[PDB]
Design a protein around this ligand. Structure first.
Ligand SMILES: *[C@@H]1O[C@H](CO)[C@@H](O[C@@H]2O[C@H](CO)[C@@H](O)[C@H](O)[C@H]2NC(C)=O)[C@H](O)[C@H]1NC(C)=O
Length: 418
């Protein structure tokens, strides 16, 4: 007879990343309808979307083309500059003192309690995005889970992670004895996908020129809201989500949903974590959920999709056209910087830094070195940005190949100085 807790985190901001905060708000409504209490649900979101100037319906958020508002009622626990990696860890550990700013709500859980964690944004190999730097590094996240387990302040925990290369956050480092079960949107090397976007099928209402959701996220949320959670197992949800996210085993506009931690937890019913909604119990015959294939966009290209459609539907015309050209060239400049550093170190052909480790291995052996090499890069080449998280394997392999900090500095200066 425990208490059910939850942490909902959006790791991004900006109207181009509408979907991520819409994902989280939708997740909150599902938990509330299921009977979870607001005091037991901590929400971390930048909160810049609902009243964004570009929002055609101010004060609302939708996570589906024909969907209703999901923004109303969502608590403002940690918004704006308080959405940090440090606050996320502190909330999860339930240490109210370590929290800086915000409402001060934390997961002060007890040994018999259940915890549900859901992250949604951007990502890269070994890294999860945050709207305020520094980003989340996998080792710090796993270590936080270890301390939480050591305190023994929970019975079991389930974690859902929506991000690109999200499997890399847990592979090679996530233990199976922490009473934690984890699912991720993709494996350690592949892209994730956003959905309900303009120019595709299905599309949002024409006034929306940005993506409403993400494939993996809307997969489990639409699943939970249309099924009896007293009957459905975690095992069944994983199976359904994996199938939809893979675009039904075609992997064309789809990714590989991965799982980590203790798999025996999968036998349990979803209501122990997500609550139970009586409305879903014995639905009439003609209202049973029927799912079909949906168009998607690469998670890292959803930004460009937003800028291009805003250009098409439009002096705001060229302000957007100019922002499109500048964004494109900034990304290519950043790609060139990483490529040049790799080329300087190990050459332009069969570059050793581009080698992907076998499934099951950790991305990097020295995680503190990974942080260090990123700082060196940013000191010379400028901020890596959330887009630049795609290049994180290059920095990881610099550490794995034992390249010293001095040589990285030398290569970074030659590549970006001037
Ligand atoms: C993996 O998770 C299970 C629970 O799903 C942990 O618990 C075992 O299963 C029964 C279920 O009632 C418990 O009462 C026992 O205490 C556990 N038995 C054994 C043999 O473990 C299980 O311990 C977890 N495994 C690990 C390695 O932590």
């Amino acid at each position: 007879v425990g208490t059910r807790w939850a942490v909902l985190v959006a790791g991004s901001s900006g109207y181009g990343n509408y979907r991520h905060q819409a994902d989280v708000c939708h997740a909150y409504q599902i938990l509330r309808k299921g009977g979870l209490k607001e005091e037991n649900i901590v929400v971390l979101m930048y909160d810049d979307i609902a009243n964004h100037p570009l929002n055609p319906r101010p004060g609302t958020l939708i996570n589906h083309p024909d969907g209703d508002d999901v923004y109303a009622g969502v608590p403002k626990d940690y918004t704006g500059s308080s959405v940090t990696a440090a606050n996320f860890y502190a909330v999860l550990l339930g240490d109210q003192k370590a929290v800086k700013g915000g409402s001060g709500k934390v997961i002060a859980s007890k040994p018999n309690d259940h915890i549900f964690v859901y992250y949604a944004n951007h990502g890269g190999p070994g890294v999860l995005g945050m709207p305020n730097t520094p980003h989340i590094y996998a080792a710090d996240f796993i270590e936080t889970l270890k301390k939480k387990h050591a305190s023994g302040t929970y019975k079991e925990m389930v974690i859902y992670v929506e991000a690109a290369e999200s499997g890399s956050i847990f592979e090679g480092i996530m233990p199976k004895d922490l009473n934690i079960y984890v699912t991720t949107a993709s494996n350690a090397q592949e892209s994730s996908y956003g959905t309900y976007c303009p120019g595709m099928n299905p599309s949002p209402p024409s006034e929306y020129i940005t993506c409403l959701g993400d494939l993996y996220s809307v997969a489990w949320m639409e699943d939970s809201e249309t099924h009896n959670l007293k009957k459905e197992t975690i095992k069944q949800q994983y199976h359904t989500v994996k199938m939809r996210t893979s675009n039904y085993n075609t992997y064309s506009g789809g990714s590989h949903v991965m799982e980590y931690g203790n798999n025996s937890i999968k036998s349990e019913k979803l209501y122990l974590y997500q609550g139970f909604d009586p409305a879903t119990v014995n639905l009439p015959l003609n209202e049973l959920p029927v799912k079909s294939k949906i168009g998607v966009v690469n998670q890292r290209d959803a930004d460009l999709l937003f800028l291009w459609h805003m250009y098409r539907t439009s002096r705001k015309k060229d302000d957007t056209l100019k922002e499109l050209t500048e964004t494109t060239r900034h990304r290519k400049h950043l790609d060139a910087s990483v490529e040049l550093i790799a080329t300087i170190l190990f050459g332009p052909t069969m570059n050793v830094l581009n080698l992907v480790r076998e499934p099951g291995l950790p991305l990097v052996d020295d995680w503190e070195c990974l942080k260090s090499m990123v700082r060196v890069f940013e000191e010379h080449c400028g901020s890596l940005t959330q887009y630049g998280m795609k290049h994180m394997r290059a920095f990881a392999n610099v550490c794995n190949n034992g390249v010293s900090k001095e040589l990285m500095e030398e290569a970074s200066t030659a590549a970006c100085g001037g």
